[PDB]
Amino acid sequence: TMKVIDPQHSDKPNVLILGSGWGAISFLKHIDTKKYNVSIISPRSYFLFTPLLPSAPVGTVDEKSIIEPIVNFALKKKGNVTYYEAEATSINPDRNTVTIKSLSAVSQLYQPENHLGLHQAEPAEIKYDYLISAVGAEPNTFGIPGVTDYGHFLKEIPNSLEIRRTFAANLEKANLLPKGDPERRRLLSIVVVGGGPTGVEAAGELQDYVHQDLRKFLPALAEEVQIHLVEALPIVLNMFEKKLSSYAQSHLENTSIKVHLRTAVAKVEEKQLLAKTKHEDGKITEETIPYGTLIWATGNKARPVITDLFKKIPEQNSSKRGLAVNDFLQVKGSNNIFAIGDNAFAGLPPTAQVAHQEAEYLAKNFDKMAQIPNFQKNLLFEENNFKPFKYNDLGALAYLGSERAIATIRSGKRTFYTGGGLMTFYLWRILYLSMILSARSRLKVFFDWIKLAFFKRDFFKGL
Amino acid sequence: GPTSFKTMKVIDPQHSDKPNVLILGSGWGAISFLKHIDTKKYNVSIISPRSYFLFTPLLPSAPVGTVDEKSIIEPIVNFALKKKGNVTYYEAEATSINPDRNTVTIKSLSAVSQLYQPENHLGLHQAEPAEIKYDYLISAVGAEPNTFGIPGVTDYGHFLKEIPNSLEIRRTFAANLEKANLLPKGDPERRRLLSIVVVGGGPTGVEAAGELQDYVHQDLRKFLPALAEEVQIHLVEALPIVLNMFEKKLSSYAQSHLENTSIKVHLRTAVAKVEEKQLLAKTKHEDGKITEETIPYGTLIWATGNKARPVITDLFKKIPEQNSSKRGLAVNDFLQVKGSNNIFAIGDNAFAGLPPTAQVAHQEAEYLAKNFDKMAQIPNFQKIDLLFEENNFKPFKYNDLGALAYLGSERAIATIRSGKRTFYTGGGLMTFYLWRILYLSMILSARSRLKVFFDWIKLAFFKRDFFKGL
Ligand SMILES: Cc1cc2nc3c(=O)[nH]c(=O)nc-3n(C[C@H](O)[C@H](O)[C@H](O)COP(=O)(O)OP(=O)(O)OC[C@H]3O[C@@H](n4cnc5c(N)ncnc54)[C@H](O)[C@@H]3O)c2cc1C
Ligand SMILES: Cc1cc2nc3c(=O)[nH]c(=O)nc-3n(C[C@H](O)[C@H](O)[C@H](O)COP(=O)(O)OP(=O)(O)OC[C@H]3O[C@@H](n4cnc5c(N)ncnc54)[C@H](O)[C@@H]3O)c2cc1C
Ligand SMILES: [Mg+2]
Ligand SMILES: [Mg+2]
Ligand SMILES: [Mg+2]
Ligand SMILES: [Mg+2]
Ligand SMILES: [Mg+2]
Ligand SMILES: [Mg+2]
Ligand SMILES: [Mg+2]
Ligand SMILES: [Mg+2]
Ligand SMILES: [Mg+2]
Ligand SMILES: [Mg+2]
Numbered sequence: 025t026m027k028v029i030d031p032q033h034s035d036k037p038n039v040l041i042l043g044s045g046w047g048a049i050s051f052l053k054h055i056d057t058k059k060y061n062v063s064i065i066s067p068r069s070y071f072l073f074t075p076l077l078p079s080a081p082v083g084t085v086d087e088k089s090i091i092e093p094i095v096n097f098a099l100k101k102k103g104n105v106t107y108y109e110a111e112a113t114s115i116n117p118d119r120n121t122v123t124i125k126s127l128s129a130v131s132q133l134y135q136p137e138n139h140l141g142l143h144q145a146e147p148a149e150i151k152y153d154y155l156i157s158a159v160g161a162e163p164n165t166f167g168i169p170g171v172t173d174y175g176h177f178l179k180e181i182p183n184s185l186e187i188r189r190t191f192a193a194n195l196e197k198a199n200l201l202p203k204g205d206p207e208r209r210r211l212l213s214i215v216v217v218g219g220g221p222t223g224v225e226a227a228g229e230l231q232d233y234v235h236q237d238l239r240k241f242l243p244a245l246a247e248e249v250q251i252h253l254v255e256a257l258p259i260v261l262n263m264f265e266k267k268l269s270s271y272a273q274s275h276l277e278n279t280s281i282k283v284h285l286r287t288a289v290a291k292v293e294e295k296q297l298l299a300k301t302k303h304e305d306g307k308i309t310e311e312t313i314p315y316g317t318l319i320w321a322t323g324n325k326a327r328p329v330i331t332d333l334f335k336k337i338p339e340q341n342s343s344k345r346g347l348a349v350n351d352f353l354q355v356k357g358s359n360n361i362f363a364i365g366d367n368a369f370a371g372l373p374p375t376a377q378v379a380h381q382e383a384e385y386l387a388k389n390f391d392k393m394a395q396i397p398n399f400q401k402n403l404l405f406e407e408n409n410f411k412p413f414k415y416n417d418l419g420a421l422a423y424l425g426s427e428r429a430i431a432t433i434r435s436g437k438r439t440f441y442t443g444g445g446l447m448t449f450y451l452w453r454i455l456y457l458s459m460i461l462s463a464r465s466r467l468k469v470f471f472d473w474i475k476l477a478f479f480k481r482d483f484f485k486g487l
Numbered sequence: 488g489p490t491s492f493k494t495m496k497v498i499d500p501q502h503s504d505k506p507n508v509l510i511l512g513s514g515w516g517a518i519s520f521l522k523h524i525d526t527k528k529y530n531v532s533i534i535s536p537r538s539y540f541l542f543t544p545l546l547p548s549a550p551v552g553t554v555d556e557k558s559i560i561e562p563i564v565n566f567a568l569k570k571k572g573n574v575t576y577y578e579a580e581a582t583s584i585n586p587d588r589n590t591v592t593i594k595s596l597s598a599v600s601q602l603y604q605p606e607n608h609l610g611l612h613q614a615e616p617a618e619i620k621y622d623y624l625i626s627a628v629g630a631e632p633n634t635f636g637i638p639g640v641t642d643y644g645h646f647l648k649e650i651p652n653s654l655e656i657r658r659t660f661a662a663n664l665e666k667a668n669l670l671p672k673g674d675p676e677r678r679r680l681l682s683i684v685v686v687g688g689g690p691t692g693v694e695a696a697g698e699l700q701d702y703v704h705q706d707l708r709k710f711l712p713a714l715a716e717e718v719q720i721h722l723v724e725a726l727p728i729v730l731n732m733f734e735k736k737l738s739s740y741a742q743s744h745l746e747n748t749s750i751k752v753h754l755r756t757a758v759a760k761v762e763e764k765q766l767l768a769k770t771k772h773e774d775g776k777i778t779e780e781t782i783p784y785g786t787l788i789w790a791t792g793n794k795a796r797p798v799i800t801d802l803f804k805k806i807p808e809q810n811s812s813k814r815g816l817a818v819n820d821f822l823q824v825k826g827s828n829n830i831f832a833i834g835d836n837a838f839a840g841l842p843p844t845a846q847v848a849h850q851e852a853e854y855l856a857k858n859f860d861k862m863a864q865i866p867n868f869q870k871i872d873l874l875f876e877e878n879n880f881k882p883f884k885y886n887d888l889g890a891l892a893y894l895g896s897e898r899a900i901a902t903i904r905s906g907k908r909t910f911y912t913g914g915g916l917m918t919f920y921l922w923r924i925l926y927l928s929m930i931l932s933a934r935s936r937l938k939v940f941f942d943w944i945k946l947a948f949f950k951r952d953f954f955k956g957l
Contacts, residue, residue, distance in 0.1 A: 069955075070954075086557070087957060088555070088952050088954065088957060091954075093954075095710050096950070098710075099709065099710060109665075128665055129665035129668065129669070130668070130669060131668070131710065131711070133710055137713065139671045139672075141671075142669060143669060144665075144666065144669065181957065196578075196597055196598035196613075197613065199598065199599070199600070200598070200599060200611060200612060200613065202608045202610075203608070240568065241564050241567075241568060241600065241602055242600065244606065463948070463949075464945070464948070464949040467945060467948070467949075468945065471941045471945070475934070475937060475938065475941070478933075478934070478937070479933075479934040479937075480565070482557050484539075484557065484560075484562075485538075487556060487557060487650065
């Protein structure tokens, strides 16, 4: 016997959102809670502004500054929003329910607050009239041994804390060791795997901490740290014009970062890893790299609750990366479930930028559906001349450490800005600050950057 | 046996002629001292297991995010950087003070930071014991929370002394709110989970309760009004009045206000024992009779006095003049540990008849540092207790500057004075603004001061950050 939550107080349809990230929150911001009853299931009680996560480990920004509680977005809604802090473990399409487990809390932001009768660590099924799936994707080790055990992903707030604690602990042991000790040099050694903007910014941020703050009180130690940027492709930041990639690499190397291109990690052990380089000519070299801190910033794979769903919907069996959706962001094989963000595959890159646009688009569709009597009761999309989702690539930005960035801003076929440099770094800051989804988070990031102009970064081992 | 290889690494810097001053701790005493000590005349080293200074008077507002944990601490290294000479910081714990050989034993060594060029390799290892040699010792390790022998307080309650306590209190209460809200209204377990007991009617307990009541009334109530209405905060105090260091009328003003905010105050009440989900409170009434009440609670905050640390009580036994000590090291007019001519003690680890406050610790420190300025001009100092009388050093003289207490809901009481003169004494709205301005001014670092300021500004626009595990 499973507890089934199925709210039929009003005729408003029950919209059930999975997740509290870019897709789910952008959707929540735009959905009409006067026309729809909205519920959210996510094990993370806050929205995470991912593009600034790479600057959290070293305190360029603080962890709290870049997150925003779901409840704060929920308060600004006019209707009834319920937030289940729990994890969706099974999507059950044929009975229109989602199974949740690891239930920690339930928050009903409205008057009635009918007692639901759920208990922590007790399974349950939430019923829905529409499902919006946005659970994202999870880090992909690519089958490389040791990465889970010995490295750190850069995906969630706890990763920021773990990275800081590992590196801080390493600096402390290293400094006790005599200069010239290879163990000391290992402990001051950082490997970042992934040459996309995330890996690049992580390395640039760590290099900034070392050069700007650490060096103020432990210059010799700071001089010995070596940061390594490992990338499997022939260039870093390959979504950018090649000349910007070249600018970025030269700058990174100028800040003393070592870049290993055409290089892949073959295996990871506790104190060292094996890197193989596939040269242009075709030969393969390998290097054992001792490291103290390994940051794994690359690849993402479908979550288990999503790959399980693949098997329950015939049209979805051939899916591998994410849920196949139609022009309308409807999961194929379903007329009830929509998917947006990294958990959907529609040919688009996996970015917040795409997730945010899908969401705003879908929410607007939900405005139209609520004016068409048939949708409530009962192809409807084609018939009512809904327009397909159309992604508008607005561009890309990457911080490179030491107050330089690259950026390309566009819309449609028009490029409005494309280059790198000092001013580009100020643009990076302004643009990111303007993309943040909440006034509070925006103010906190702003205060963090102001403090940074006067004082060193907070780098507390365990705080 | 006498054949033992017993070998202990001993750090004895004899590079320069400057005397080695060794400071124990990184709190009010140690840091105020560090700020004033002349590092051109003296070589300074610091031993403390805490790598940062903690601005204690704002700790009670950390658990609920009125101010953030990071905002009220400042890394030792930041104070050390502003010094002109050589400062070394041992992140480790002093476990034995060895007066007859002028050394301090350290353990749990995590790190050593030498903020100067030579940086001679010392050859220490983590989790390896060592002894640091000194020409002068400044002991300021403070005091630790006292459970008074009451069973269960350590196991089931939370102290309010250090940053980790702030985190634990938040996590306990936040977890309780979540469980409580799943329970149906009227369930006694729900009512227990929303129940908070603060033991200690001094400014620390009062502010802790006031801050929690603020979080509940201002922020929690915004999104969970029914839950917020059900929380009950209890202030338990063994004396007949709260805040007994204040004028009695201010105490009465404070209690009435606390009770207005819905805090329940139990005076003349002492906790006899603490179990996991409940505690036993006994009230000794004026007439002489004793009543007892079992109080179910979800969160217990224990803010009542402290006691001497083990490394201090061990020292009691090694110095004949100090055997009769119980609360702290007995010092003379010059803050010299009696029975010693080498060791000075300031802060809560010393007993000189003064109250145990940051206010006293800070003044002892500035005073001692100034003495060290004088000693460095008198060739002979380079026995000692006489030199002080002889060279007409003045005894330490504490100047009580007053007291403040925040009471929740933007009210405070305060009495500001100097000597026999009272410059301010009362309570209310403006007193709360004074509380803020005065505390902001008392903070020891520009960084911490800016962060607290930003925290209070954010507070005017947004709810407090109350993350269960962050
Ligand atoms: C460090 C970093 C930096 C990035 N920088 C950029 C950038 O600069 N520009 C850009 O365009 N993109 C950037 N991205 C990519 C962007 O973050 C993702 O594409 C975006 O997260 C996709 O949005 P989403 O809603 O699909 O998933 P997410 O934002 O990851 O949200 C997923 C949500 O689902 C929740 N969840 C997980 N499992 C379950 C479950 N079983 N049940 C219910 N909920 C669950 C998660 O807790 C989370 O709340 C960055 C990503 C990272 C990691
Ligand atoms: C919550 C709270 C609020 C307070 N509010 C006020 C107030 O508003 N006004 C006021 O006047 N007073 C206040 N106080 C009291 C004030 O904080 C203390 O009197 C002050 O700490 C005494 O200074 P100290 O240097 O002796 O000890 P502390 O400031 O506590 O410093 C002790 C230092 O010693 C370190 N240490 C501990 N053990 C060892 C060891 N074995 N070896 C080396 N180092 C060690 C500790 O880490 C710490 O760094 C408050 C105290 C608390 C707990
Ligand atoms: Mg999402
Ligand atoms: Mg997110
Ligand atoms: Mg509302
Ligand atoms: Mg998704
Ligand atoms: Mg994702
Ligand atoms: Mg490691
Ligand atoms: Mg101290
Ligand atoms: Mg302190
Ligand atoms: Mg103390
Ligand atoms: Mg002391």
